[PDB]
Amino acid sequence: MREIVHIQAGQCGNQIGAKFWEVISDEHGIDPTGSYHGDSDLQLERINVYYNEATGNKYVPRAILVDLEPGTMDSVRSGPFGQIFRPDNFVFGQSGAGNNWAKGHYTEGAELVDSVLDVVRKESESCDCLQGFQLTHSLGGGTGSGMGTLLISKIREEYPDRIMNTFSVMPSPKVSDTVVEPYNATLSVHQLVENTDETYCIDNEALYDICFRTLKLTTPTYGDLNHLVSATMSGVTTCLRFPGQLNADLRKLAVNMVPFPRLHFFMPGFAPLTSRQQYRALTVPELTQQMFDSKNMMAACDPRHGRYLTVAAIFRGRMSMKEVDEQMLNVQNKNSSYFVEWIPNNVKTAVCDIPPRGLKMSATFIGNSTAIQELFKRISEQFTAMFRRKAFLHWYTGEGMDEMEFTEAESNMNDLVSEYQQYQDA
Amino acid sequence: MEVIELNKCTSGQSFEVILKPPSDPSLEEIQKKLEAAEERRKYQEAELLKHLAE
Amino acid sequence: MRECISIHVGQAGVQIGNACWELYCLEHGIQPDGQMPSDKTIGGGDDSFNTFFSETGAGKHVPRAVFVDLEPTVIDEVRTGTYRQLFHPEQLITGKEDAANNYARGHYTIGKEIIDLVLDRIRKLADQCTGLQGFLVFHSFGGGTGSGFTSLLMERLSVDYGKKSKLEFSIYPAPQVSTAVVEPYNSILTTHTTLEHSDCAFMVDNEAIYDICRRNLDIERPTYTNLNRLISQIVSSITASLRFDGALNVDLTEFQTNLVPYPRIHFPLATYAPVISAEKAYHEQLSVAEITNACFEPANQMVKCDPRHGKYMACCLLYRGDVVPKDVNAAIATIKTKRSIQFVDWCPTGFKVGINYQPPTVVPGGDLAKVQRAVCMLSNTTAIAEAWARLDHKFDLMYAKRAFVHWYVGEGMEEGEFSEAREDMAALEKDYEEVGVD
Amino acid sequence: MYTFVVRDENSSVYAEVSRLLLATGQWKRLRKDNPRFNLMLGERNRLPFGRLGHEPGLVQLVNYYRGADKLCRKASLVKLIKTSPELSESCTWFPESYVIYPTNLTDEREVFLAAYNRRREGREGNVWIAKSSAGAGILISSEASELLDFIDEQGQVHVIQKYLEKPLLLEPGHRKFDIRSWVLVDHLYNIYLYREGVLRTSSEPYNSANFQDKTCHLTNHCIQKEYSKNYGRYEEGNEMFFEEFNQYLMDALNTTLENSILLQIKHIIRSCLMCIEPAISTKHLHYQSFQLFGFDFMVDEELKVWLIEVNGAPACAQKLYAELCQGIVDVAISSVFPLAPTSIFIKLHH
Numbered sequence A: 001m002r003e004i005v006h007i008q009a010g011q012c013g014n015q016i017g018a019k020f021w022e023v024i025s026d027e028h029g030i031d032p033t034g035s036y037h038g039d040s041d042l043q044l045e046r047i048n049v050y051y052n053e054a055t056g057n058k059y060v061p062r063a064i065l066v067d068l069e070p071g072t073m074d075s076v077r078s079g080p081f082g083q084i085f086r087p088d089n090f091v092f093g094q095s096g097a098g099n100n101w102a103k104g105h106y107t108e109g110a111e112l113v114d115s116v117l118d119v120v121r122k123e124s125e126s127c128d129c130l131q132g133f134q135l136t137h138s139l140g141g142g143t144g145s146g147m148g149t150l151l152i153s154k155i156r157e158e159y160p161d162r163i164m165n166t167f168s169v170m171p172s173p174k175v176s177d178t179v180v181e182p183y184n185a186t187l188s189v190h191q192l193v194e195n196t197d198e199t200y201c202i203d204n205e206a207l208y209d210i211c212f213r214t215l216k217l218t219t220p221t222y223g224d225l226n227h228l229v230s231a232t233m234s235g236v237t238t239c240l241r242f243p244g245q246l247n248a249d250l251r252k253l254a255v256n257m258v259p260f261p262r263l264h265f266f267m268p269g270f271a272p273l274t275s276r277q278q279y280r281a282l283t284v285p286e287l288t289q290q291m292f293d294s295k296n297m298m299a300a301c302d303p304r305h306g307r308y309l310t311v312a313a314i315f316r317g318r319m320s321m322k323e324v325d326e327q328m329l330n331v332q333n334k335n336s337s338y339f340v341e342w343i344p345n346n347v348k349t350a351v352c353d354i355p356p357r358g359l360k361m362s363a364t365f366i367g368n369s370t371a372i373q374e375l376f377k378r379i380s381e382q383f384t385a386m387f388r389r390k391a392f393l394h395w396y397t398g399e400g401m402d403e404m405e406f407t408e409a410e411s412n413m414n415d416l417v418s419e420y421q422q423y424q425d426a
Numbered sequence B: 001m002e003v004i005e006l007n008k009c010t011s012g013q014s015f016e017v018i019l020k021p022p023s024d025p026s027l028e029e030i031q032k033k034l035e036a037a038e039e040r041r042k043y044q045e046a047e048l049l050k051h052l053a054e
Numbered sequence C: 001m002r003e004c005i006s007i008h009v010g011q012a013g014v015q016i017g018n019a020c021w022e023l024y025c026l027e028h029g030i031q032p033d034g035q036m037p038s039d040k041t042i043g044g045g046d047d048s049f050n051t052f053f054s055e056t057g058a059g060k061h062v063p064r065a066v067f068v069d070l071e072p073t074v075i076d077e078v079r080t081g082t083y084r085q086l087f088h089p090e091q092l093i094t095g096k097e098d099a100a101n102n103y104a105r106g107h108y109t110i111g112k113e114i115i116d117l118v119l120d121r122i123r124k125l126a127d128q129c130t131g132l133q134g135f136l137v138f139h140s141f142g143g144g145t146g147s148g149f150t151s152l153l154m155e156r157l158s159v160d161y162g163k164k165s166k167l168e169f170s171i172y173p174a175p176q177v178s179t180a181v182v183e184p185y186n187s188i189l190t191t192h193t194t195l196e197h198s199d200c201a202f203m204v205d206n207e208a209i210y211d212i213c214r215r216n217l218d219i220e221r222p223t224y225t226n227l228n229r230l231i232s233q234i235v236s237s238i239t240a241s242l243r244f245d246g247a248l249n250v251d252l253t254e255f256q257t258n259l260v261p262y263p264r265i266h267f268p269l270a271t272y273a274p275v276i277s278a279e280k281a282y283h284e285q286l287s288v289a290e291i292t293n294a295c296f297e298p299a300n301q302m303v304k305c306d307p308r309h310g311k312y313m314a315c316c317l318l319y320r321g322d323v324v325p326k327d328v329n330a331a332i333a334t335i336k337t338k339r340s341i342q343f344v345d346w347c348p349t350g351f352k353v354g355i356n357y358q359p360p361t362v363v364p365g366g367d368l369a370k371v372q373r374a375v376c377m378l379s380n381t382t383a384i385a386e387a388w389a390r391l392d393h394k395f396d397l398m399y400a401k402r403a404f405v406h407w408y409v410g411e412g413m414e415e416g417e418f419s420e421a422r423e424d425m426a427a428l429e430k431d432y433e434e435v436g437v438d
Numbered sequence D: 001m002y003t004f005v006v007r008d009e010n011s012s013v014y015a016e017v018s019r020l021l022l023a024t025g026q027w028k029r030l031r032k033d034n035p036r037f038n039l040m041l042g043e044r045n046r047l048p049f050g051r052l053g054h055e056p057g058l059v060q061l062v063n064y065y066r067g068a069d070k071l072c073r074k075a076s077l078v079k080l081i082k083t084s085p086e087l088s089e090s091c092t093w094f095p096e097s098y099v100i101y102p103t104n105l106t107d108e109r110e111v112f113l114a115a116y117n118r119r120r121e122g123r124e125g126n127v128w129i130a131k132s133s134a135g136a137g138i139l140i141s142s143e144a145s146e147l148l149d150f151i152d153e154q155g156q157v158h159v160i161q162k163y164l165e166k167p168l169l170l171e172p173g174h175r176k177f178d179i180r181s182w183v184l185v186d187h188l189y190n191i192y193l194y195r196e197g198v199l200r201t202s203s204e205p206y207n208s209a210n211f212q213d214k215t216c217h218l219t220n221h222c223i224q225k226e227y228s229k230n231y232g233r234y235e236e237g238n239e240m241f242f243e244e245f246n247q248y249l250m251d252a253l254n255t256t257l258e259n260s261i262l263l264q265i266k267h268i269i270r271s272c273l274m275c276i277e278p279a280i281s282t283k284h285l286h287y288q289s290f291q292l293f294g295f296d297f298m299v300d301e302e303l304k305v306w307l308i309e310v311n312g313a314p315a316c317a318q319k320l321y322a323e324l325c326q327g328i329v330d331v332a333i334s335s336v337f338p339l340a341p342t343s344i345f346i347k348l349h350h
């Protein structure tokens, strides 16, 4: 049993995390009360990766809910699957974080972090063999961003040889709550560069555009954005939740996807993405072409502007595994200019028999592309437009930070950008 | 095309046809390698913890 | 009689080992419970099959085998499979977390902490042997356990059993069924440290087994079960001389004497024929000349390469079924006048022939059809150097950028071991070229 | 969309094929080190055949037959003819040749002298030519002492061959010549002979009493354009094509190019290529081969054709590039990778 401990922090992180557990719970046949009612043995063969088994055959998500205000976690505890979570695994304060990274990381968050670690330690102590951790959070806020990266730092200190994995929502001015989001995101990114093994980059602007342009949703809501993230999180974790050969555990996935330690920021993709013509059967060619289309990717980075270091594709449903290889090989051989030639066979494909809910088949795309530097360039440019005038810094100096820490975070992310560039022309 | 060393038994036979003639580390050195790698891991992990302590 | 111990390391080794012992049992008439009605010496004896099977007082015939994997899921199938009754728990060793396709993890980090336990389990089997010949080690090149732990085990085996032979069955990585991008790294790292400890190694390229399963067995997308059933037939053909009465390759030493005059060049090419689909309704039985001629077809080789553009140092014909020496020699003469067979000038141009009258056994419900006669040719040809070239090229592509190197250094391996291993391969490729090309 | 790579920038032939391939819009050129290709236009020397046919899902094709060097090397060709039963030492269309290794290094020194002394005693013409593959370095002499001494001053393998002392001379001019034939072998081992050959003529009168000056004895294009004064007088570039040559044979010899010469050329091409087919065929191989060959023939005053050598990396006559290169794309490349006449080749059956 290779158990994974899940942590969700802050508003964004708890709303996306709640939907995630809702989606996979349905896939594994777990009802909102933790009772199994599936009809396939493949649903339970790797259930212990994410669920603990309690008395009475109950399955409890190995999840820890963290926040500095009660509001969102109240909504979770009353939502659909709210009753499925361990009551003791709700850890929250009352003051909030005011969308302030320093509050989450240095002051408000510092007061609460130890109690969160007590729950993490409890969950890990009951794992036969812990693989590692996955964290869901945003980088634009204060709790998920500032405290989330604080948790990662303290988790790595206590479990230095375990894999740390995150789903990180990147802010965008088109879907923004406050103007300080680039500050919070730049500070978090440096933490992630140093303390995570895999980070799935999810851009709120890409989620919005997909909801508007592709799904034809006139007025997207955070809820609409979160359903795309739920479906994407389910896709990337299929290799971990069902029997398979490729990317079986977190460490093997990291070894196949991360050729250099700092360049561990992935672009996820999903197919199909259909508006409500929703009953039409999709073909393997259609799945493949859409999966590799930029409009189906959720980092708002044009892959044709960079090159893939590694790619991990996952096909779900009953389909022609022979016809899967043929389309995959067709994509690589028809666009070999976008794949680095100094990593042979860097595109790996895996098949899963069980399809997502409401679909005969689907495909999930995980790319480690140098094009991701466009995402960090945007953040960096937005950071500098304000920092050059020290705008809004007083929110942060009032928590004990000084300008030097900002200058270093700015330089750290520009170094990262420079590192991606050197491999885009190699 | 000569047949030599023809051997026959209840379960088979074997022979040789000739078409043409012609014209370590000690147990100690292995422990050092293993322990040396273990030391390099310990050193790197100590630097990481030292980094986190700062 | 002298005993042989089989060792299966990693997923590839374990799953292949499971398929071989299944076939061994069917070939010797041993039931899943270990009973052998044809064995009239209850709880003892020194027959040819006793080289691979010990016996308990109750008449159980137990394989002389050890299974090792740094993760328990693959070996739990053996504990719960059809032949679970065959083995006892001492023979099955499993860790809790695997090598993550990281040679350095299997060799150093995890291997250091489990090597003594594996040697202790092997020592128990050795203590049951009155004249142990040596070991047959099954493993993959690409995996972290099959590459990393195997090389450590071979090093220790040479220390604990200095005078014992060691043969390999190694699975060469093929992207069509490969799960890792760093497998060229692992293959080269494990060949470098194992080369001086292996007396003879049979490489099976998954790409070759894969295409034979699609071409000859009409399987659109072969599974590991399909690949392993076919591989176990080739393995059986090679080991038959140790398990049945005969006079060719009667002990492990004879494998080196007959196939490896040059110690470092110890990788014989295996070619097998015929492979006929069981689903095939009407089938015409092939003659001795037809199956012998097929041994010189690239499409039937365990490693795709062109022996026409290499030199032979040794050649062995292993027949099973209805075959008589008269028909073998006639087929051989015909092939010389038509095929490109060039031996090295310092080696006799000849063939050692072994015939076993019992035709190949087929697993019920398997993919292979029953044939009246079959052959496996073992030829030590320089043409197999094509495989090292393909593999070293991929190595060079990644290592020029140090891609993925941090994963290995992070497990305590020095970066200098990469170049050390690569230079050893460059010298191996040079050895082949000096023996083959003019 | 098909993919190909170019690994021989010096090939005038496959520079035109690459230019044509891209003109179709259905072929894409990758970097010379990209493994995901359908077609390789490989280097001349040390072509890595061992890395072909191992990319899943790619049918890969290469413009060189592994093992064809046996035919396109001076010493190799001689050995192949003497040792191969389908050619035999009594091969009537290949000049008597001997492989000679310089003394500073099997070798056929004694066998050569035996045949040489036999000719010297018999009053027969005893003129031989010494040549090698490492040449631009050729010597023609009637004394065996000068030939052997010339090879010893070198350091590479050479071949002493009987010099055709009765070559067919074109009139007017009284000049020597040779014939170049372009032959294309596809992946199925069909032998196609390009309907267009070229005679590389000497612009100097053939002089049989002076082999020291090799301008009227060597019909190479670079030699006539460098050490000959009458280059281009009788025909442009000392290149006479089959149309003009066929008309000549009829006016002066009352015969045709087909009957008098072409039947022997087609026989020789087929004999050489069929001989090595088992050794170089890619029928059951994991990759596919094809190759363009340049055969060089001599013709004597008896209208008997002799094979001089075979070139594995030949060029083409400036006038015939467009036609031949296009034909290469039709029968060699498109046959395996079809797109979305009156063939210009003569299929030699077998």
Ligand SMILES: Nc1nc2c(ncn2[C@@H]2O[C@H](COP(=O)(O)OP(=O)(O)OP(=O)(O)O)[C@@H](O)[C@H]2O)c(=O)[nH]1
Pocket: C009, C010, C011, C012, C013, C015, C016, C069, C070, C071, C098, C099, C100, C101, C102, C106, C140, C141, C142, C143, C144, C145, C146, C147, C171, C172, C173, C174, C177, C178, C179, C183, C206, C224, C227, C228, C231
């Ligand atoms: N022929 C064959 N090849 C296999 C089999 N299992 C794995 N492989 C090949 O082995 C390579 C992967 O190495 P594994 O043996 O699975 O890894 P391992 O030895 O268990 O080591 P770990 O990294 O700890 O998992 C790939 O090239 C696979 O294609 C098998 O059952 N049969």
Ligand SMILES: Nc1ncnc2c1ncn2[C@@H]1O[C@H](COP(=O)(O)OP(=O)(O)CP(=O)(O)O)[C@@H](O)[C@H]1O
Pocket: D095, D129, D131, D135, D136, D161, D162, D163, D164, D165, D177, D178, D217, D218, D219, D220, D296, D298, D308, D309, D311
């Ligand atoms: N046996 C022989 N008798 C008479 N002339 C000969 C001959 N062998 C060669 N020659 C002359 O020498 C010339 C070149 O010979 P050869 O072909 O060996 O050199 P080479 O290979 O450098 C020219 P190519 O570019 O066609 O390969 C020919 O044009 C021919 O006229």
Ligand SMILES: Nc1nc2c(ncn2[C@@H]2O[C@H](COP(=O)(O)OP(=O)(O)O)[C@@H](O)[C@H]2O)c(=O)[nH]1
Pocket: A009, A010, A011, A012, A013, A015, A016, A097, A098, A099, A100, A138, A139, A140, A141, A142, A143, A144, A145, A169, A170, A171, A172, A175, A176, A177, A181, A204, A207, A222, A223, A225, A226, A229
């Ligand atoms: N996709 C998505 N993004 C969100 C959601 N809620 C907030 N965000 C984004 O997260 C950032 C604000 O961080 P938030 O999680 O609200 O702050 P926190 O509670 O202190 O961690 C902004 O960039 C928002 O666009 C949500 O439900 N879904």
Ligand SMILES: [Ca+2]
Pocket: A095, A108, A111
């Ligand atoms: Ca407080």
Ligand SMILES: [Ca+2]
Pocket: C039, C040, C041, C042, C043, C044, C045, C055
């Ligand atoms: Ca007995």
Ligand SMILES: [Ca+2]
Pocket: B024, C158, C162, C196, C197
């Ligand atoms: Ca030894």
Ligand SMILES: [Mg+2]
Pocket: A011, A012, A141, A177
């Ligand atoms: Mg908020």
Ligand SMILES: [Mg+2]
Pocket: C010, C011, C071, C098, C099, C143, C145
């Ligand atoms: Mg394994």
Ligand SMILES: [Mg+2]
Pocket: D309, D310, D311
């Ligand atoms: Mg030449």
